[PDB]
């Protein structure tokens, strides 16, 4: 089962309205789909006899500030049955909720929490969507390109209050940007 | 339990806004106990800050934005009750408990 | 299955036969020599490539090797290096400031690779723990002092490693 | 004779004094688990079994076969109790 | 009676020194098995390490958490330490070398063993920590469980001897040591002593890495020291009982004039030292059981075997009229 | 149900491990790991680095398998650049990948043993770790974060006499494995702590994205060195051990057998090691030698460019994965044509494995939780990034 | 006071000897630096041969080694464990991350040096410091403990 | 230069990777017979000692 | 700020709040200590790298005093003790060090601002010997430095205070609380943070605090009894009191005063039965209407209820 | 007499039995070797001049490489 067979067989068998873009390349076979079809496309690929995509390797977001739908959500999937990989991507914005695939691949649960934490994209029907990496009470989504590298707040011990507290950042030496272009 | 779909209309969104406000207000006694606010602020002042927050966003017309605001409010409330980060006159992001502004800003610094 | 195999299984269970073997091999290392190093009288082995405390080097005449190219500052993954430079009174291109924050540095050796004149090196010293954070903010003079103290070992190491780089 | 118990008492007092010196010199510079009740009951029963064995073991040379068989009957009753406890899962802690 | 305190001190002080050095010997033998050196810097061959750790511990500030059981919290380590000390009044080291020649000394030892649980229980409850309390309950349960087997083994020995006097038990082994015919009983006794002293492979309080907080987790400074010292003094005692009951106490290996030249206290010490080496050797050799596994072992393996051995020994001696 | 908040807070178990357990007495009902205690924003920081400056971040993800992640990152860059790596370099990269596998398994196996009470094998295994740590130091000058495997090959050639010292290590290593086995394998206590603990079926392993030993324990024959080979793994003989029961005892036996197979690979790399360059010859991506840089204008210009600007990578995106000691380690790299990565998503096997702690530990005793965490082989540097 | 000073100095030497010869550190293994610290306790360097025994609870600890990156999320947990340590207590910062933030200094989630949370007595440089470097740092801790005169200061207070 | 680290002429000596087995133990009937004989003869000796003590 | 301040006696209760507030305004703080190096250790946490610098000194050594002051242009004195030790008398700790500090600061010549911290009831005709020595220091510091600023806080409340903590310790260890004067003495207890805020405010003004003496008291007046109700409400325990008349209280506070200057070894500090503080309790100590209060420094003091007593949670 | 309190020095004294003097540096530190095979042939040690208050940083740079097996040249050969 080579990438030549997957590209051709997916063109013949998939419903046409699901896939808007198909890229066959040595970097990877990629299927771009609308958000309303992502869940169904991933269920087809998992259950169909000639694809048997049973493992969701991971889900990640990419931020494209110059785009109307700035977020790209990428699903890297694997078929151990046919020894092949597939990439399924869809686009999203700051307020549009997309479908969760936890009911298809239980491993998606923590990855979708990471996407919500890092980018602010929300997932319909996710059993427990809350931040997973950042500190409690964190504000913002650090992987957005407009989020500053050093953030907005920092912590320190405050003896009068006998506790660790958060205050606006003060940098002894700033990050030096070296524009080498 | 799961994240519900995006609200169809402002009636669905408002039902959700009312539901959140009710949950936020019903947790007020728990917060007062966690942060020991019995001698700092009144429970109604906590209620006013929550209703204020909601009233500042009364000009939003897009149900998707309202859903995101409710989700972020629910997340903020859960942290305050479960993982309290105690600061004296501050709960989360809420301060609890003859010259114009220009001349004050001028006296302070050159950056307004 | 068989009264003889059942018997052997029962006896092995009741008399802890496999627990004896673990005891026997445990006792064998009791009498053998130990591998402990008697630090600080004895030390562990290191190599000429070891990445330790940074140092600034001079030419044998006493002139500094550094010509403030700032390549090390640019390549540094931790942004631990700060450099200021200007023309010296004799027209030479030299730093007026060369700071390495030893608490930001990740001891990667990228700076030593980037330097075109073998001026900045990671020397072999690894025993330089301090009592204050500020003592680990190395300025140019501290770095040149390190170079003077460790020059004999640094030069020998560079001769050794000049066949690989 | 009970004379030999007096050194035990003086020993206890001295041990107490040592305990207090060691402990004092530094002051100068809602979930009921029935399986614990069940292990307590088992221990109590077999505690009484060890207790009734002490006189028997020292008296075996005089009581002869009659005493041996009466102790065996005693054990048989208590071991039937033990088998009941075993089959009922009182000896399982998983 | 005026010189009785001198005898008691000549027992208690060397025992506290012997415990200090047992801790050192445990650290040395485990180190050597692991190809390491062990404490060898603080004093020549590390021989001053016990003194340094003891002085460090007494120089540590006490903590005393804000609990409603201030008195019991401090009393629990005293209780266990005292219990560990007081058992030695009846231990004979040689013929005539014993503080109290109790005719009921066997039952007295069993009673002290039975009292040992209260220090752990009380420490766990008085700590105001559910982790400490749960760990304490499990340790107490394990101790009482293995006390049953210890007691039934004591009964086997008593049947052979016919007297509770410890010196009489030793002197009844002149013909033959009891560990030869009753070697399985000796094995089960040594294992039951490991489980009663909470030692590896049964050391639940050591399994903090395993999400099991021990009963002494809240203790610091000298209360923590008293718990540790009581536990180690119990290990020397259990090694002394293994020696008295099955290895013929102070008697020589062979009834020969060459072996009778070295005194009985040396024989007793050497056998005690063999057993203390095995306590450490086992710690160094095996992993540990879970709580449920060792509880199952206690009730389902060691109670039945101990009971069966009582029946078999008494029946064999009654049949052929070999009773004492 | 009462809740137990148990966070092993020292090298005893991980160190940033924090678990919320719901118990029924001693039986575990639900396990909820709380993570992010080691989240340092590595993925955000990488976007501000050139491709060379981001390389040391990979040594610090699974900080027990340092060179294996450097390999994965270098392979991803070589893939997008279409860079050819000399044969000698490929053999050195495979040789040190398998050395890195042994370092990992030695630590994973003996730290798990120490947590269940076997204190001795940790000490024996760490003296073998020191010998292998010496090989890291002799090639790179660092014991752990070598930064030795780079896009295009390796940083430096092997010092004379290193291959002989590795051969002397291999001659004796089988005996060291046999002693770790004799301590644990046959021992009835060891078997009671691991047999039928944390059973995973093959469907469960695929559903939760398990990889490596966590997947091969369930009888699924899947190793990326054979399924999607890279470097010279296709010229090497080794077996892929698989389990038959999918519990903690199979995964222990597999990790032991995997060290014997790693030893086998290292021997073949030693014997088949060819002469030649250790760096791709192209003069746009690899530093010149010191003598060349100090004698040739072209070489100096290239050196200046490489250590200030860094190389550019043409705009594209791809996912690259290797068989790391802990499972499939993947890098989703997005290039925008510039000298800094636009996006670097790091796929860590421990992220998938720790997420499956809840179903693996269900209805198990409290003391089995550490055993299950041990067989998963969790390092939070890669879980949290 | 030609006699009381001599007796005070001997008491203080004895207290210093006890405290340097018995250092029981509570390990705070956070990241890669913990692995080098595990090697320090292992057979080749054998911290136990110096009387150094690693304890699991802060109640029984004289010293805390911060070995690895401290995040904002973990900072309160570190400080709480420090506050449970009975006096006298010392802190050793191990590695660039714990010293000043290291490779992650400019991150949004990292504490830029553990000395912002607890007071630090010894800083051990390196990323990671070698096992021998940590051993050198612990011997520097012993050098600072030996400068203490706890009896003399209390006598004069 | 031209000298690079590598195998010696003919390659390194072969190394074993497989578990070499060990048959060490009396096992089975040896231990059971030893223990049973010890029990019987030692209990007879216990009888003799008790008679002497009497 | 370019302020380099040498704060004497910063290793005590008020000192930690002052150093933190001085670190906030960017001032570099020098912290002279007389004993162990672990006494200023908690102050290093405050401020940036190199901002808080502890330095060893000897109260009875003029050389060390000018050594630690040689680099500063602001000097704050907090040194003082409420009890007696055989080595330092009330006048030794409350007046002789204070005067010596003013004299070296006068021979320094570079000390722009000098602040001496005193007690509210510091008067020459005061029953307490501590307050008498305090008042003598007030005049002596002024005589040596007319431009100095005196501050007179009342009994300060905070985590490490010596009033509510010893009461709570006593109540938990015995079950009752004694009243040394029937719980009728009127004092104005002040949050310790407010005192530090006042000192920083006096350092930040346009020069309009030099030569004056401020009386810092809490926003509300309290009796010994009324303060004890705040303590009982916070620690969630049943109030129980034993009225102890003055001649019975002085009797229990006689031994330590009697034998402190005779026995050759140190004595524990007195918590509640300190004779000098009992003598202060005979008369009310309130803020005079003609003095300069918190309102003079554009400051409003914090009411005791709430956070200022939140540390009492640890006793429940 | 330092051997009684300082067990670290004693271990060096015992291992010194049968060793060979390689050189002495400026500070008085003495350098020994055995030429055996116990720790894989690593038998280089230093006996510090100060029997008390010795410290690892007292080894000069000329002898540091020898002591750490970085080089086979002694401090004397390097200085020449
Ligand atoms: C970690 O394990 C360890 C301990 O801590 C739990 C120890 O208990 C200890 C240290 C404790 C000991 C057994 C020392 C010997 C015991 C003693 C005789 C008393 C303990 C204290 C001292 C040495 C000083 C005695 C001082 C007094 C209390 C005044 C009486 C005169 C060791 C050896 C240890 O390594
Ligand atoms: N209730 C209160 O707290 C009130 C106090 N005040 C006054 O305010 C000042 C500061 O208060 P507070 O911080 O609570 O006081 P503390 O007693 O807690 O601290 C006093 C400071 O002075 C030092 N000190 C004490 N005696 C001597 C001495 N003989 N030689 C050298 N240094 C010495 C102490 O150092 P060390 O720790 O080393 O002893 C400490 O740093 C004091 O002068 C006090 O009298 C004002 C009103 C009431
Ligand atoms: S070692 Fe690396 S991180 Fe440190 S200064 Fe040199 S280049 Fe920068
Ligand atoms: S040290 Fe080297 S690389 Fe750095 S500025 Fe000087 S000459 Fe350039
Ligand atoms: S200092 Fe370096 S080795 Fe240590 S934890 Fe930080 S990144 Fe890892």
Which CATH number characterizes residue D16's domain?
Answer: 1.20.58.1610
Q: How far apart are CA G155 and CA E59, in angstroms?
A: 16
The label of the residue with tokens 């009994």 reads I155
Q: What is the distance between the terminal CA atoms of chain I, rounded to a whole angstrom?
A: 43
3-class DSSP state for residue C33?
coil
Q: Is the CB of C66 under 6 A from ligand 3?
A: no
Q: Are residues F127 and G15 in contact, defined by beta-carbon separation less than 8 angstroms?
A: no
Q: What is the count of structural domains for chain I? A: 1
Locate D20 and state its tokens: 């207090």
Dihedral of alpha carbons F187, F189, F192, F197, sign: negative
Interchain CB contact of E61 with I (< 8 Å): no
- Rounded to the nearest 5°, which phi and psi values hold at E260? -80, 5
Locate F312 and state its tokens: 């550019």
Which of G34, G97, G113 should be mutated for ligand 5, with most atoms under 8 A from CB?
G97
Q: How far apart are CA E220 and CA G5, in angstroms?
A: 32
Q: Which ligand is nearest to the CA of I118?
A: 2
Whether omega before F108 lies within 30 degrees of 0, making that bond cis, reads: no
Q: Are residues A28 and A87 in contact, defined by beta-carbon separation less than 8 angstroms?
A: yes
Dihedral of alpha carbons J38, J40, J41, J43, sign: negative
Q: Which residues pair with F324 in a beta bridge?
A: F327
Closest CA to A43 of A122, A1, A125, A100: A100
Q: What is the count of structural domains for chain D? A: 1
DSSP secondary-structure letter at C48? T
Provide the number of CB pairs (under 8 Å) joining chain E to chain I: 3
Interchain CB contact of E32 with C (< 8 Å): yes
Residues 6+ apart with CB under 8 A from E94: E250, E263, E264, E265, E268
Q: Are residues I210 and I142 in contact, defined by beta-carbon separation less than 8 angstroms?
A: no
Count of C-beta atoms within a 10 Å radius of residue B60: 14
H or E element that contains I84:
none
Q: How far apart are CA F79 and CA F151, in angstroms?
A: 9
H or E element that contains F343:
strand F343-347
Method of determination used here:
cryo-EM
For residues A153-176, one letter each, b for 16 or more C-beta atoms within 10 angstroms of the residue's C-beta and e for the rest, the string is bbbbbbebbeebbbeeeeeeeeee
User: What would the DSSP string read from start to end of F194-249?
Assistant: HTTSS---HHHHHHTT--THHHHTTT----HHHHS--TTGGG--------SS-SHH
Q: How far apart are CA B111 and CA I173, in angstroms?
A: 57
User: What would the DSSP string read from start to end of A49-113?
Assistant: TTT---EEEEEEEEE-TTSSS-EEEEEEEEETTTTEEEEEEEEE-SS--EE--TTT-TTHHHHHH
Dihedral of alpha carbons F303, F304, F307, F313, sign: negative
Q: What is the distance between the terminal CA atoms of chain A, rounded to a whole angstrom?
A: 43
Q: How far apart are CA I185 and CA I162, in angstroms?
A: 17
Q: Are residues E324 and F58 in contact, defined by beta-carbon separation less than 8 angstroms?
A: no
Q: How far apart are CA I127 and CA I104, in angstroms?
A: 31
- Rounded to the nearest 5°, which phi and psi values hold at D7? -60, -30
Q: How far apart are CA F374 and CA E125, in angstroms?
A: 32
Q: Three-state SS string across chain E, please?
A: CCCHHHHHHHHHHHHHHHHHHHHHHHHHHHHHHCCCCCCCCECHHHCCHHHHHHHHHHCCCCCCCCCCCHHHHHHHHHHHHHHHHHHHHHCCCECCECCCCCCCHHHHHHHHHHHCHHHHHHHHHHCCCHHHHHHHHHHHHHHHHHHHHHHHHHHHHHHHHCCCCHHHHHHCCCCCCCCCCCHHHHHHHHHHHHHHCCCCCCCHHHHHHHCCCCCCCCCCHHHHHHHHHHHHHHHHHHHHHHHHHHCCCCCCCCCCCCHHHCCHHHHHHHHHHHHHHHHHHHHHHCCCCCHHHHHHHHHHHHHHHHHHHHHHHHHHHHHHCCCC
Domain-embedded: residue D94: no
Which of C110, C121, C122, C136 should be mutated for ligand 3, with most atoms under 8 A from CB?
C110
Q: How far apart are CA G38 and CA F126, in angstroms?
A: 9
3-class DSSP state for residue G118?
coil
Chain A residues near residue B88 by CB distance under 8 angstroms: 161
Count of C-beta atoms within a 10 Å radius of residue B45: 15
DSSP secondary-structure letter at J6? B
Residue span of the structural domain in which D37 resides? 5-88
Q: How far apart are CA G58 and CA G54, in angstroms?
A: 10
Q: Are residues J31 and J23 in contact, defined by beta-carbon separation less than 8 angstroms?
A: yes
Chain F residues near residue G44 by CB distance under 8 angstroms: 126-127, 130
Q: Are residues F340 and F51 in contact, defined by beta-carbon separation less than 8 angstroms?
A: yes
DSSP secondary-structure letter at I95? I
Q: Are residues F276 and F88 in contact, defined by beta-carbon separation less than 8 angstroms?
A: yes
The label of the residue with tokens 């010296």 reads C88
Q: F271, H7: Cβ pair inside 8 Å?
A: yes
Dihedral of alpha carbons E146, E148, E150, E156, sign: negative
User: Nearest chain E Cα to J13, which residue?
Assistant: E44
Interface with chain C: mutation pick from G42, G43, G100, highest number of C CBs within 10 Å: G100
Domain-embedded: residue D56: yes
Q: How far apart are CA F143 and CA F134, in angstroms?
A: 7
Q: How far apart are CA F51 and CA F74, in angstroms?
A: 10
Q: Are residues F69 and F254 in contact, defined by beta-carbon separation less than 8 angstroms?
A: no
- Rounded to the nearest 5°, which phi and psi values hold at E180? -80, -60
Q: Quote the ligand 5 centre to G30 CA distance (angstroms).
A: 9
Domain-embedded: residue D71: yes
Q: Is the CB of G38 under 6 A from ligand 5?
A: no
Q: How far apart are CA G65 and CA G54, in angstroms?
A: 10
Chain A residues near residue C74 by CB distance under 8 angstroms: 178, 180
**E24 CA: distance to closest CA in chain G (Å):** 10
Q: Quote the ligand 3 centre to G67 CA distance (angstroms).
A: 20
Treating both helix axes as pointing N-terminal to C-terminal, what angle do E303-320 and D34-87 enclose, rounded to 10 degrees? Answer: 50
User: What would the DSSP string read from start to end of H27-49?
Assistant: -THHHHHHHHHHHHHHHHHHHHH
Question: What are the helix (H) ranges across I128-176?
Answer: 129-144, 164-174
Interface with chain J: mutation pick from E40, E41, E42, highest number of J CBs within 10 Å: E41
**C4 CA: distance to closest CA in chain E (Å):** 22
> Which ligand 2 atom minimizes the distance to the CA of I87?
29
- Rounded to the nearest 5°, which phi and psi values hold at E160? -65, -40
Nearest to A96 among B64, B92, B93 (CB): B64
Residue span of the structural domain in which I68 resides? 1-316
Q: Are residues I244 and I179 in contact, defined by beta-carbon separation less than 8 angstroms?
A: yes
> Which ligand 3 atom minimizes the distance to the CA of C77?
3
Q: How far apart are CA E306 and CA E292, in angstroms?
A: 20
Q: How far apart are CA B49 and CA B16, in angstroms?
A: 19
PDB resolution in Å: 2.8
């Amino acid at each position: 089962m080579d990438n030549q067979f997957i590209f051709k067989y997916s063109w013949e068998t998939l419903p046409k309205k699901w896939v808007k873009k198909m890229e066959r390349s040595e970097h990877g076979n990629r299927f771009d789909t609308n958000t309303d079809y992502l869940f169904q496309l991933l269920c087809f690929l998992k259950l169909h006899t000639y694809t048997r995509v049973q493992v969701l390797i991971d889900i990640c977001g990419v931020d494209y500030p110059s785009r109307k739908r700035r977020f790209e959500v990428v699903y890297n999937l694997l078929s151990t049955r046919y020894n092949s990989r597939i990439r399924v991507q869809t686009s999203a914005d700051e307020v549009t909720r997309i479908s969760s695939v936890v009911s298809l691949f239980p491993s998606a649960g923590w990855w979708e929490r990471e996407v919500w934490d890092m980018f602010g994209v929300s997932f319909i029907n996710h059993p427990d969507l809350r931040r997973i990496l950042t500190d409690y009470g964190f504000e913002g989504h650090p992987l957005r390109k407009d989020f500053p590298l050093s953030g907005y707040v920092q912590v320190r011990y405050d003896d009068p209050e006998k506790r660790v507290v958060s205050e606006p950042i003060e940098m002894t030496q700033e990050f030096r940007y070296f524009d080498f272009a | 339990i799961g994240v519900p779909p995006n609200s169809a209309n402002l009636t669905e969104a408002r039902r959700r806004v009312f539901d959140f406000f009710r949950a936020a207000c019903r947790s007020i006694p728990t917060i007062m106990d966690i942060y020991n606010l019995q001698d700092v602020v009144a429970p109604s002042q906590l209620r006013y800050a929550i209703s204020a927050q909601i009233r500042n966003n009364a000009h939003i017309t897009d149900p998707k934005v309202i859903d995101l605001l409710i989700f972020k409010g629910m997340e903020e409330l859960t942290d305050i009750v479960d993982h309290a980060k105690q600061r004296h006159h501050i709960i989360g992001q809420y301060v609890v408990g003859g010259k114009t502004d220009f001349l004050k800003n001028f006296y302070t610094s050159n950056y307004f | 299955k068989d009264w003889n195999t059942v018997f052997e299984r029962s006896i092995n269970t009741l008399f802890l036969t496999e627990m004896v073997r673990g005891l026997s091999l445990t006792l064998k290392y009791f009498f053998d020599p130990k591998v402990t190093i008697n630090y600080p009288f004895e030390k562990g082995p290191l190599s000429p490539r070891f990445r330790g405390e940074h140092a600034l080097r001079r030419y044998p005449t006493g002139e500094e090797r550094c010509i403030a190219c700032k390549l090390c500052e640019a390549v540094c993954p931790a942004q631990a290096i700060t450099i200021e430079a200007e023309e010296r009174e004799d027209g030479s291109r030299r730093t007026t400031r060369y700071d390495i924050d030893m608490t930001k540095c990740i001891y990667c050796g990228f700076c030593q690779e980037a330097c075109p004149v073998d001026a900045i090196v990671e020397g072999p010293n690894f025993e330089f723990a301090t009592e204050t954070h500020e003592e680990l903010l190395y300025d140019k003079e501290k770095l040149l002092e390190n170079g003077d103290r460790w020059e004999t070992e640094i030069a020998e190491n560079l001769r050794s490693e000049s066949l690989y780089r | 004779m009970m004379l030999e118990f007096a050194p035990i008492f003086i020993y206890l007092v001295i041990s107490l004094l040592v305990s207090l010196i060691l402990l004092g010199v530094p002051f100068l510079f809602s979930r009921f688990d029935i399986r614990f009740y069940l292990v307590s009951i088992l221990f109590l029963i077999f505690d009484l079994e060890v207790t009734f064995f002490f006189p028997w073991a020292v008296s075996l040379n005089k009581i002869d076969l009659f005493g041996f068989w009466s102790m065996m009957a005693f054990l048989f009753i208590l071991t039937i109790g033990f088998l009941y406890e075993w089959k009922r899962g009182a000896l399982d802690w998983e | 009676y005026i010189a009785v305190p001198a005898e008691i001190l000549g027992i208690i002080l060397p025992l506290l020194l012997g415990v200090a050095f047992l801790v050192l010997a445990e650290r040395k033998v485990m180190a050597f098995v692991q190809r390491r050196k062990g404490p060898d810097v603080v004093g020549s061959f590390g021989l001053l390490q016990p003194l340094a750790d003891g002085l460090k511990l007494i120089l540590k500030e006490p903590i005393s958490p804000s609990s409603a059981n201030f008195f019991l919290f401090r009393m629990a380590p005293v209780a266990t330490f005292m219990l560990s000390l007081v058992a030695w009044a009846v231990v004979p080291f040689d013929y005539g070398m014993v503080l109290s020649d109790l005719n009921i000394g066997l039952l007295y030892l069993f009673a002290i063993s039975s009292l040992g649980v209260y220090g752990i229980i009380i420490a766990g409850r008085s700590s105001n920590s559910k982790y400490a309390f749960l760990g304490a309950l499990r340790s107490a349960a394990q101790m009482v469980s293995y006390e049953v087997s210890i007691g039934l083994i004591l009964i086997t020995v008593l049947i052979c001897v016919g007297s509770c006097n410890l010196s009489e038990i030793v002197m009844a082994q002149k013909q033959i040591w009891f560990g030869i015919p009753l070697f399985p009983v000796l094995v089960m006794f040594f294992i039951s002593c490991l489980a009663e002293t909470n030692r590896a492979p049964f050391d639940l309080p050591e399994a903090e890495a395993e999400l099991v907080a021990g009963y002494n987790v809240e203790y610091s400074s000298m209360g923590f020291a008293l718990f540790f010292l009581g536990e180690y003094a119990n290990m020397i005692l259990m090694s002394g009982l293994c020696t008295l009951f099955f290895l013929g106490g102070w008697l020589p290996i062979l009834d020969l004039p060459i072996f009778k030249k070295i005194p009985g206290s040396i024989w007793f010490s050497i056998k005690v030292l063999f057993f203390l080496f095995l306590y450490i050797w086992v710690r160094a050799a095996f992993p540990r059981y879970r709580y449920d596994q060792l509880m199952g072992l206690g009730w389902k393996v060691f109670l039945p075997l101990s009971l069966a051995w009582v029946v078999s020994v008494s029946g064999l001696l009654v049949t052929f009229q070999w009773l004492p | 149900n009462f809740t137990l908040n148990f966070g092993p807070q020292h090298p005893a178990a991980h160190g940033v491990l924090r678990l919320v357990l719901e118990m029924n007495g001693e039986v575990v009902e639900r396990a909820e790991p709380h993570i992010g205690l080691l989240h340092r924003g590595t993925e955000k920081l990488i976007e501000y680095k050139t491709y060379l400056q981001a390389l040391p971040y990979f040594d610090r993800l699974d900080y027990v398998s340092m060179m294996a992640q450097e390999h994965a990152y270098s392979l991803a860059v070589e893939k997008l650049l279409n860079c050819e790596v000399p044969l000698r370099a490929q053999y050195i990269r495979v040789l040190f990948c398998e050395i890195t596998r042994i370092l990992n398994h030695l630590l994973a196996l003996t730290t798990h043993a120490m947590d269940v009470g076997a204190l001795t094998p940790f000490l024996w295994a760490f003296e073998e770790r020191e010998k292998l740590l010496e090989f890291y130091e002799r090639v790179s000058g660092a014991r752990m974060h070598a930064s030795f495997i780079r896009p295009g090959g390796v940083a430096q050639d092997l010092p004379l006499g290193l291959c002989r010292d590795i051969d002397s290590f291999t001659q004796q290593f089988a005996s060291r494995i046999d002693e770790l086995e004799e301590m644990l394998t046959g021992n009835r206590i060891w078997k009671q702590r691991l047999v039928d603990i944390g059973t995973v079926t093959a469907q469960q392993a695929k559903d939760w994205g398990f990889s490596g030993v966590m997947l091969r324990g369930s009888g699924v024959c899947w190793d990326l060195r054979r399924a999607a080979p890279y470097d010279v793994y296709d010229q090497l003989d080794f077996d892929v051990p698989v389990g038959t029961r999918g519990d903690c005892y199979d995964r222990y036996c597999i990790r032991i057998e995997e060290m014997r197979q790693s030893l086998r690979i290292i021997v073949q790399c030693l014997n088949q090691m060819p002469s030649g360059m250790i760096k791709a010859d192209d003069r746009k991506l690899c530093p010149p030698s010191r003598c060349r840089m100090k004698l040739s204008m072209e070489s100096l210009i290239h050196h200046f460019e490489l250590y200030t600007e860094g190389f550019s990578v043409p705009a594209s995106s791809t996912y690259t994965a290797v068989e790391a000691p802990k499972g499939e380690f993947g890098v989703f790299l997005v290039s925008n044509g510039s000298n800094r990565p636009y996006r670097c998503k790091i796929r860590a096997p421990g992220f998938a494995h720790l997420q499956g702690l809840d179903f693996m530990s269900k209805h198990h005793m409290l003391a089995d939780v550490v055993t299950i965490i041990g067989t998963q082989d969790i390092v939070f540097g890669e879980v949290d990034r | 006071s030609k006699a009381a000073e001599f007796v005070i100095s001997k008491v203080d030497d004895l207290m210093n000897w006890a405290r340097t010869g018995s250092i029981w550190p509570m390990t705070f293994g956070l990241a890669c630096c913990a692995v080098e610290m595990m090697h320090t306790g292992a057979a080749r360097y054998d911290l136990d041969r110096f009387g150094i025994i690693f304890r699991p609870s802060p109640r029984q600890s004289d010293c805390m080694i911060v070995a690895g990156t401290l995040t904002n999320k973990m900072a309160p947990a570190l400080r709480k464990v420090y506050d449970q340590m009975p006096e006298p207590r010392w802190v050793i910062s191990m590695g660039s991350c714990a010293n000043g933030g290291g490779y992650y200094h400019y991150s949004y989630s990292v504490v830029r040096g553990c000395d912002r949370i607890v007071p630090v007595d010894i800083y051990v440089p390196g990323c990671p410091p070698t096992a021998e470097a940590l051993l050198y740092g612990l011997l520097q801790l012993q050098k600072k403990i030996n400068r203490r005169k706890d009896f003399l200061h209390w006598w004069n207070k | 230069p031209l000298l690079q680290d590598g195998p010696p002429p003919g390659g390194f000596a072969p190394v074993r990777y497989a578990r070499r087995i060990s048959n060490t133990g009396p096992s089975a009937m040896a231990m059971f017979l030893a223990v049973s004989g010890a029990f019987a003869w030692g209990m007879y000796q216990v009888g003799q000692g008790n008679k002497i003590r009497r | 700020s370019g302020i380099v301040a040498t704060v004497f006696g910063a290793t005590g209760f008020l000192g930690r709040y002052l150093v933190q507030q001085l670190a906030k305004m960017g001032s570099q703080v020098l912290v002279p200590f007389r004993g162990s190096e672990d006494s200023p250790r908690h102050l290093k946490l405050m401020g940036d790298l190199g901002q808080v610098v502890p330095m060893k000194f000897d109260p009875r050594d003029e050389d060390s005093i000018k050594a630690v002051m040689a680099k500063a242009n602001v000097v704050i004195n907090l040194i003082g003790r409420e009890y007696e030790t055989r080595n330092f008398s009330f006048e030794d700790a409350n007046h002789h060090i204070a005067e010596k500090l003013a004299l070296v600061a006068k021979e320094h010549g570079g000390i722009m601002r000098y602040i001496q911290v005193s007690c509210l009831g510091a008067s020459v005709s005061s029953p307490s010997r501590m307050l008498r020595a305090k008042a003598a220091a007030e005049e002596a510091v002024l005589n040596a430095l007319p431009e100095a600023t005196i501050m007179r806080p009342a009994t300060m409340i905070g985590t490490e205070d010596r009033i509510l903590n010893p009461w709570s310790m006593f109540v938990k260890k015995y079950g009752f609380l004694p009243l040394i004067g029937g719980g009728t003495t009127k004092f104005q207890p002040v949050y310790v943070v407010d005192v530090a805020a006042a000192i920083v405010a006096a350092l930040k003004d346009d020069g309009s605090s030099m030569g004056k003496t401020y009386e810092l008291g809490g926003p509300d007046v309290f009796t010994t009894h009324e303060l004890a109700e705040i303590m009982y409400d916070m620690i969630r325990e049943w109030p129980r009191y034993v009225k102890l008349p003055f001649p019975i209280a002085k009797a229990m506070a006689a031994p330590r005063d009697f034998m402190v200057n005779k026995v050759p070894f140190p004595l524990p500090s007195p918590q509640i039965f300190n004779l000098d503080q009992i003598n202060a309790l005979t008369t009310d100590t309130l803020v005079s209407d003609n003095a300069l209060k918190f309102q003079d420094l554009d400051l409003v003091p914090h009411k005791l209820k709430g956070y200022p007593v939140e540390f009492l949670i640890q006793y429940r | 007499m330092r051997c009684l309190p300082d067990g670290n020095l004693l271990q060096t004294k015992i291992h010194n039995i049968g060793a060979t003097l390689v050189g002495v540096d400026k500070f008085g530190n003495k350098y020994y070797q055995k030429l055996g095979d116990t720790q894989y042939g690593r038998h280089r040690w230093v006996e510090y001049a100060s029997k008390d208050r010795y410290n690892a940083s007292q080894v000069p740079a000329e002898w540091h490489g020898w002591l750490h097996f970085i080089t086979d040249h002694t401090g004397d050969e390097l200085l020449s």
